Amino acid sequence: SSSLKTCYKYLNQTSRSFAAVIQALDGEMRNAVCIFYLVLRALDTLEDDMTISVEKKVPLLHNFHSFLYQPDWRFMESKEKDRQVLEDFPTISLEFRNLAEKYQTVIADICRRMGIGMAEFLDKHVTSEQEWDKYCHYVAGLVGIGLSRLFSASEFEDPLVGEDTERANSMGLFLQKTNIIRDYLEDQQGGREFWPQEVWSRYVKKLGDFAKPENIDLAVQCLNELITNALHHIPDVITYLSRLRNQSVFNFCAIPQVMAIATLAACYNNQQVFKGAVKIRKGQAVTLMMDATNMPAVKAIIYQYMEEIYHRIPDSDPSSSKTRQIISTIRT
Amino acid sequence: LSSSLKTCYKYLNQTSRSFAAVIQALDGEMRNAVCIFYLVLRALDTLEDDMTISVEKKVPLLHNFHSFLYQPDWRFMESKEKDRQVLEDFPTISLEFRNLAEKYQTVIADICRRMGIGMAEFLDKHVTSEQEWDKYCHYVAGLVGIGLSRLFSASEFEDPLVGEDTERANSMGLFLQKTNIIRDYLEDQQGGREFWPQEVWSRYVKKLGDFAKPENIDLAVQCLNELITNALHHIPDVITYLSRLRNQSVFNFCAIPQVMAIATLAACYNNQQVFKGAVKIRKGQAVTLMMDATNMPAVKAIIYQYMEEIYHRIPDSDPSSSKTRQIISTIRTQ
Amino acid sequence: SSSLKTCYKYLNQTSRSFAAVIQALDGEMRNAVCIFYLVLRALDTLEDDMTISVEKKVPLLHNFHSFLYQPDWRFMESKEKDRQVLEDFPTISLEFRNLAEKYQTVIADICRRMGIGMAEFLDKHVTSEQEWDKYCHYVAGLVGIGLSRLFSASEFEDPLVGEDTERANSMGLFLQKTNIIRDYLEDQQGGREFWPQEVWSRYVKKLGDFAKPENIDLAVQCLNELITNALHHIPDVITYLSRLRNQSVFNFCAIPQVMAIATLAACYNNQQVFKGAVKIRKGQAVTLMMDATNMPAVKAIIYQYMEEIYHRIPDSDPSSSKTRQIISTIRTQ
Numbered sequence: 001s002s003s004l005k006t007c008y009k010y011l012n013q014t015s016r017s018f019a020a021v022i023q024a025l026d027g028e029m030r031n032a033v034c035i036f037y038l039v040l041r042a043l044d045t046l047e048d049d050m051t052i053s054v055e056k057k058v059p060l061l062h063n064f065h066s067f068l069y070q071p072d073w074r075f076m077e078s079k080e081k082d083r084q085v086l087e088d089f090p091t092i093s094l095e096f097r098n099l100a101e102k103y104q105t106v107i108a109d110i111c112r113r114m115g116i117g118m119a120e121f122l123d124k125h126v127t128s129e130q131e132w133d134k135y136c137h138y139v140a141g142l143v144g145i146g147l148s149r150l151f152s153a154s155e156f157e158d159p160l161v162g163e164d165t166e167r168a169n170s171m172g173l174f175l176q177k178t179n180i181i182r183d184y185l186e187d188q189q190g191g192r193e194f195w196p197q198e199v200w201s202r203y204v205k206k207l208g209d210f211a212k213p214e215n216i217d218l219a220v221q222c223l224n225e226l227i228t229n230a231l232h233h234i235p236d237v238i239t240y241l242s243r244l245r246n247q248s249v250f251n252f253c254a255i256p257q258v259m260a261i262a263t264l265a266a267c268y269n270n271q272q273v274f275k276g277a278v279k280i281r282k283g284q285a286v287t288l289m290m291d292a293t294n295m296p297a298v299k300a301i302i303y304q305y306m307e308e309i310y311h312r313i314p315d316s317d318p319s320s321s322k323t324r325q326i327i328s329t330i331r332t
Numbered sequence: 333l334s335s336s337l338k339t340c341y342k343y344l345n346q347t348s349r350s351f352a353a354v355i356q357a358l359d360g361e362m363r364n365a366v367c368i369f370y371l372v373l374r375a376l377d378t379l380e381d382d383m384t385i386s387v388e389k390k391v392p393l394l395h396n397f398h399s400f401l402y403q404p405d406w407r408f409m410e411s412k413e414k415d416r417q418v419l420e421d422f423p424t425i426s427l428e429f430r431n432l433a434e435k436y437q438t439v440i441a442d443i444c445r446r447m448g449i450g451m452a453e454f455l456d457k458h459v460t461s462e463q464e465w466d467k468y469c470h471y472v473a474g475l476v477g478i479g480l481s482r483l484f485s486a487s488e489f490e491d492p493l494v495g496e497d498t499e500r501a502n503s504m505g506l507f508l509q510k511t512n513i514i515r516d517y518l519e520d521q522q523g524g525r526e527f528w529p530q531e532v533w534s535r536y537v538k539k540l541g542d543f544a545k546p547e548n549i550d551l552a553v554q555c556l557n558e559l560i561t562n563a564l565h566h567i568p569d570v571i572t573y574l575s576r577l578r579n580q581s582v583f584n585f586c587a588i589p590q591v592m593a594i595a596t597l598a599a600c601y602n603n604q605q606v607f608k609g610a611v612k613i614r615k616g617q618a619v620t621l622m623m624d625a626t627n628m629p630a631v632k633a634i635i636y637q638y639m640e641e642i643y644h645r646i647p648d649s650d651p652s653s654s655k656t657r658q659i660i661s662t663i664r665t666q
Numbered sequence: 667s668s669s670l671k672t673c674y675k676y677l678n679q680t681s682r683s684f685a686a687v688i689q690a691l692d693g694e695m696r697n698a699v700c701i702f703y704l705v706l707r708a709l710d711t712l713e714d715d716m717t718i719s720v721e722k723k724v725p726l727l728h729n730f731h732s733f734l735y736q737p738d739w740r741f742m743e744s745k746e747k748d749r750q751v752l753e754d755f756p757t758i759s760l761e762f763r764n765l766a767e768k769y770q771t772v773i774a775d776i777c778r779r780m781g782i783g784m785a786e787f788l789d790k791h792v793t794s795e796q797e798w799d800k801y802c803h804y805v806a807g808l809v810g811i812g813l814s815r816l817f818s819a820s821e822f823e824d825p826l827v828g829e830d831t832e833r834a835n836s837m838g839l840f841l842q843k844t845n846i847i848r849d850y851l852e853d854q855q856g857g858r859e860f861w862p863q864e865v866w867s868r869y870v871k872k873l874g875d876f877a878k879p880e881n882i883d884l885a886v887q888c889l890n891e892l893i894t895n896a897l898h899h900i901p902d903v904i905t906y907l908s909r910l911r912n913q914s915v916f917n918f919c920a921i922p923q924v925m926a927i928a929t930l931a932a933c934y935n936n937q938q939v940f941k942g943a944v945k946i947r948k949g950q951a952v953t954l955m956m957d958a959t960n961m962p963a964v965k966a967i968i969y970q971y972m973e974e975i976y977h978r979i980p981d982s983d984p985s986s987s988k989t990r991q992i993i994s995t996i997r998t999q
């Protein structure tokens with residue numbers, strides 16, 4: 001199939017973090033997840049594009065799930081770097097329609113629900129931590145749920161994996177929150193605001209104020225509060241990973257979680273978050289000897305990163321008691 | 333505890349920097365069987381390569397080598413090669429060969445018999461067509477993969493289907509050998525050896541040595557890229573072969589060299605340094621370092637990362653560019 | 667349990683190398699080994715503290731196994747960095763007393779035997795290679811034996827693991843010897859001598875003489891002799907590791923052994939041992955694509971490190987033949 005070849009070309013051209021682990025998935029999961037990735041990428045590209053007015057955008061978000069069944073549908077007006085997935089959408093939708101119906105049902109349901117949620121947030125910033133969870137559920141939690149439903153529908157994993165939507169949602173939330181935290185500065189420069197207003201406003205008058213070097217102390221305090229919030233999903237991440245029985249699915253799920261945890265640990269109490277590039281420095285000697293492909297190794301890696309954070313908690317930090325508590329819970 | 337076997341492991345380690353440790357890690361009877369297979373093929377290789385041995389002396393040595401396995405006093409004292417201790421003390425090696433179970437002797441002798449004929453056939457001639465390149469690689473490397481695969485299955489650590497699949501075992505060997513030949517252009521040219529297929533190189537230059545000259549660099553790189561594209565064709569068979577394996581020790585032994593060869597092709601792709609000496613197999617991307625080459629899905633993911641490392645660098649102007657994209661695309665969708 | 671939470675806090679704060687792998691252990695092994703670590707660390711903290719007189723220290727070491735059973739016992743006079751495990755010992759011992767009886771038997775047995783052995787060595791240095799094994803047995807071999815007994819008691823591993831005490835002892839001796847070899851200079855400036863006198867005295871008048879630049883050739887020869895001694899434990903290490911069936915136990919056991927082997931290879935015939943800290947080099951290409959989490963990979967990594975030593979054995983070294991011989995035995999087995 002030349003259209004499937006094109007889809008895999010687009011996957012590799014677009015995804016640095018997931019292309020390899022997706023292409024390594026066993027059997028039918030590989031095409032189902034490749035197509036799921038591309039279709040959500042097309043949806044995201046619409047969401048992100050500030051040249052599409054809110055009034056024009058909402059009906060596209062709302063109806064995107066149905067465009068999967070309109071063989072000629074494409075979008076030619078995107079100004080985004082990845083617009084090829086929208087311009088050549090018929091190639092992707094054709095391959096979506098070639099998936100077994102059980103996978104189509106999952107992918108279309110997720111697109112529909114994600115479209116509704118993305119549309120809700122076009123006109124508003126994130127206010128409370130509860131709203132943060134809602135926004136993250138819409139753009140990432142639902143991805144974890146959809147992937148889990150595909151794993152179960154394929155029979156490569158237990159039915160519990162797709163049924164336990166709270167655990168799957170946590171998988172997505174941990175990744176999205178980590179990205180939001182790490183990307184403060186890049187988002188500030190693109191005029192984007194994802195840090196929850198009810199948290200940041202306790203520190204500064206404007207979210208952009210964290211980029212000013214005179215506010216670095218308060219910035220790092222807010223940073224630490226948000227990291228503490230994200231750490232709450234780690235028990236569910238461990239539970240989720242602990243239930244997987246397929247090696248290719250385990251690799252696909254575990255590697256990105258471990259990269260996120262590494263990233264949160266590097267960002268903890270780190271002024272660099274507000275100043276530029278934060279790179280992961282190599283871990284404890286013991287954990288360098290293992291990779292993230294069996295559960296005891298993944299747990300050890302996670303515990304090492306939790307101690308890297310725990311060790312750095314400033315007594316003066318306003319979240320310090322809470323940071324110790326969640327880490328202690330993760331350890332329990 | 334056997335002094336002759338101890339000596340064979342000494343020779344394995346004197347000669348092999350990169351296979352010895354994974355051979356020694358093999359389960360049960362495969363360990364000795366593959367150690368001995370390595371040393372016997374090493375002795376044959378040393379004869380093939382020794383340019384001080386006249387062709388008319390060399391042909392019978394290569395043809396009859398499999399017979400020497402059953403001649404307890406046979407040795408060869410006239411080699412000038414660096415690995416000649418395996419020929420000079422061949423009786424120690426053949427003694428340990430004759431201590432192997434018959435099922436392993438049968439495989440090893442059969443491969444030696446067939447390899448000797450193939451090696452003898454190529455003494456007077458260079459590789460012309462790509463089909464001849466496959467034939468030569470079959471004789472000196474494909475047959476190694478086939479022999480190993482038959483040893484795995486004879487030991488019963490692997491399913492009989494592993495030894496049965498001679499076509500994909502052959503591809504495993506071809507992939508490694510073509511990678512080596514590609515990488516070692518310059519070392520070979522300085523030793524007066526020509527392994528690049530004439531039907532390919534002669535479309536660029538008048539002599540193969542012409543690629544060593546700095547004025548021919550663009551052409552040399554184009555030919556390099558054409559040969560790499562040829563070698564990438566074995567990757568689907570490599571993936572299928574490795575996917576069938578069920579023994580961890582066998583898996584590590586087979587998968588690690590394939591991944592290293594893919595890493596080598598990626599470092600060599602479109603790389604002028606091939607014609608100036610040694611190519612540094614670089615450090616890979618973030619996702620790559622998160623996994624090792626010891627389970628099949630991780631091996632697949634590593635392979636795909638390297639395929640994208642090549643794909644991203646294909647120059648539009650390269651004469652093989654659509655073909656390189658095509659084979660990578662096939663590997664991705666398999 | 668807030669006391670169990672505290673024990674894990676102490677585990678993470680103290681153990682840079684073992685906290686993560688301990689916490690990753692399956693089922694009942696996790697608490698059993700976390701507690702085993704904390705109590706042995708407490709015992710070690712008493713042993714190490716040069717401000718505690720021998721008069722006071724002997725009864726502390728002898729009676730330590732019984733303090734596990736005395737709910738109010740603590741020690742408030744430590745001047746060591748890790749004194750919290752001593753000052754808050756009742757928290758650790760409460761959790762100890764909550765372990766299954768089968769685990770308590772093992773932990774208290776090792777604490778009793780280690781305390782006795784540690785006390786023997788307060789008044790003396792290590793003389794013979796046999797005394798070196800005895801000392802390492804007391805402070806590391808018994809840890810290997812205790813851990814192996816916990817694995818078998820938990821039934822995550824076969825009975826053989828805890829039964830074969832010689833193999834478990836070798837696991838401990840290999841680590842301990844590697845550490846002592848590596849740490850020559852740091853111990854020399856701490857006023858500590860662990861290199862066996864019957865070996866070093868064949869080279870120099872005083873152990874500290876190896877730190878003097880003019881003595882470097884003799885120092886390196888002695889280093890190589892001791893390395894050769896430690897390599898004799900590798901067959902047992904391979905036998906031990908090859909018997910493990912549990913992934914979490916395998917990770918916990920194999921990684922330290924591989925790091926020790928890498929360290930010995932980095933130290934072999936290396937003058938830097940006597941000038942400070944030794945760089946553990948980037949490994950041979952084939953091994954860089956493997957981790958230490960399955961047995962064939964661990965074998966290949968160990969075998970590769972053996973060849974790195976072998977390659978470096980110079981003919982003029984007085985132990986050269988012995989070093990080749992042990993490596994040759996490990997290759998062929």
Ligand SMILES: C=C(CC[C@]12O[C@H](C(=O)O)[C@@](O)(C(=O)O)[C@](C(=O)O)(O1)[C@H](OC(=O)/C=C/[C@@H](C)C[C@@H](C)CC)[C@H]2O)[C@@H](OC(C)=O)[C@H](C)Cc1ccccc1
Pocket residue numbers: 014015016017018019033036037038040041044139140143174175176178179256257259260263
């Ligand atoms: C659009 C989406 C992602 C856009 C994205 O853009 C990048 C870019 O434009 O550059 C990207 O292309 C790149 O970085 O190359 C990247 C990629 O690599 O894929 O893709 C990025 O990946 C990460 O950020 C990963 C971060 C943690 C794993 C690691 C730590 C370090 C921080 C947590 C991501 O930002 C998602 O959809 C929605 C609705 O969000 C998927 C389609 C959902 C899905 C995922 C898997 C299967 C199926 C569907």
Ligand SMILES: C=C(CC[C@]12O[C@H](C(=O)O)[C@@](O)(C(=O)O)[C@](C(=O)O)(O1)[C@H](OC(=O)/C=C/[C@@H](C)C[C@@H](C)CC)[C@H]2O)[C@@H](OC(C)=O)[C@H](C)Cc1ccccc1
Pocket residue numbers: 347348349350351352366369370371373374377472473476508511512588589590592593596952
């Ligand atoms: C003679 C032969 C090889 C000569 C060879 O000479 C080298 C040298 O002369 O120096 C070598 O000695 C060295 O490098 O030390 C080396 C070695 O290491 O063993 O041996 C080399 O190998 C590698 O380097 C391999 C590296 C991978 C890990 C990654 C690569 C493939 C990425 C590109 C190889 O060139 C074969 O016989 C024939 C007929 O070919 C074997 C006996 C066949 C066999 C193999 C296995 C089991 C049984 C039999």
Ligand SMILES: C=C(CC[C@]12O[C@H](C(=O)O)[C@@](O)(C(=O)O)[C@](C(=O)O)(O1)[C@H](OC(=O)/C=C/[C@@H](C)C[C@@H](C)CC)[C@H]2O)[C@@H](OC(C)=O)[C@H](C)Cc1ccccc1
Pocket residue numbers: 286680681682683684685699702703704706707710805806809813841842844845921922923925926929
């Ligand atoms: C006191 C003890 C340890 C003192 C120790 O102090 C360090 C410090 O004070 O800094 C330490 O805390 C640190 O370095 O952080 C450290 C740690 O990491 O735990 O702990 C150190 O360990 C390593 O570095 C080991 C590195 C290998 C993985 C690789 C090496 C062998 C390559 C050469 C160690 O010196 C033992 O008891 C006795 C009686 O000795 C345990 C309790 C015994 C036990 C072990 C496991 C389970 C149960 C019991």
Ligand SMILES: [Mg+2]
Pocket residue numbers: 821822823
């Ligand atoms: Mg059991």
